[PDB]
From Swiss-Prot:
Impact when changing residue 86 to D: Abolished binding to histone H4 acetylated at 'Lys-12' (H4K12ac)
Residue ranges of domain Bromo in the record: 2-108
Entry's free-text remark on domains: The first bromo domain specifically recognizes histone H4 acetylated at 'Lys-12' (H4K12ac). It also specifically binds histone H4 acetyl-methylated at 'Lys-5' and 'Lys-12' (H4K5acme and H4K12acme, respectively). The second bromo domain recognizes and binds histone H4 acetylated at 'Lys-5' and 'Lys-12' (H4K5ac and H4K12ac, respectively).
Outcome when changing residue 6 to A: Loss of homodimerization
Other comment: Some specific inhibitors of BRD2 that prevent binding to acetylated histone are promising therapeutic molecules for the treatment of cancers or inflammatory diseases. ABBV-744, a small molecule, has been tested on tumors with success: ABBV-744 antiproliferative activity is mainly restricted to cell lines of acute myeloid leukaemia and prostate cancer and is able to displace BRD4 from chromatin. GSK046 (iBET-BD2), which specifically inhibits the second bromo domain, is a promising therapeutic small molecule for the treatment of inflammatory and autoimmune diseases.
Consequence the record notes for mutating residue 81 to K: Loss of homodimerization
Native species: Homo sapiens
Name recorded for this polypeptide: Bromodomain-containing protein 2
Binding site for a protein: 40, 83-85, 88-89
Family membership noted in the UniProt record: Belongs to the BET family.
Quaternary state and interactors: Homodimer. Interacts with E2F1. Interacts with (acetylated) STAT3; promoting STAT3 recruitment to chromatin. Interacts with CTCF; promoting BRD2 recruitment to chromatin. (Microbial infection) Interacts with herpes virus 8 protein LANA1.
Upper taxonomic lineage: Eukaryota, Metazoa, Chordata, Craniata, Vertebrata
Amino acid sequence: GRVTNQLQYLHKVVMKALWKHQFAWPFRQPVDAVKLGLPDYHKIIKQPMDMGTIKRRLENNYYWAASECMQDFNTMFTNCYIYNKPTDDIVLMAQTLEKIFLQKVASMPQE
Ligand SMILES: O=c1cc(N2CCOCC2)oc2c(-c3ccc4c(c3)OCCO4)cccc12
Ligand SMILES: [Cl-]
Ligand code: NA
């Protein structure tokens, strides 16, 4: 639809909801493989993404299309499912956030 209305919705509705969720705090800033002691993070994960980057991108008019911003969200979730083992707590927190993301996206404006 209208790119501006869609991106405002991603920022004002989708992102604000996910940012304030009780599972959000591991994703407000980039993964720090050193401090977490993740030796092979940047080996296995080639496109790191966090909610802080997406937020800054939305606020700086980085995106040309809602689907770009949606792709960055998806990369953040996908990175988490890939680097981690199926039963780590972060996997379930990412899954919880991602479902809300898809719920919200189903109500994105088209004009
Ligand atoms: O995919 C990820 C990989 C890991 N791992 C570390 C431990 O969990 C297993 C593997 O953490 C991530 C974190 C994270 C950030 C800060 C933390 C945290 C986790 O845990 C408590 C202490 O502050 C955030 C986003 C993605 C991942
Ligand atoms: Cl954790
Ligand atoms: Na948990």
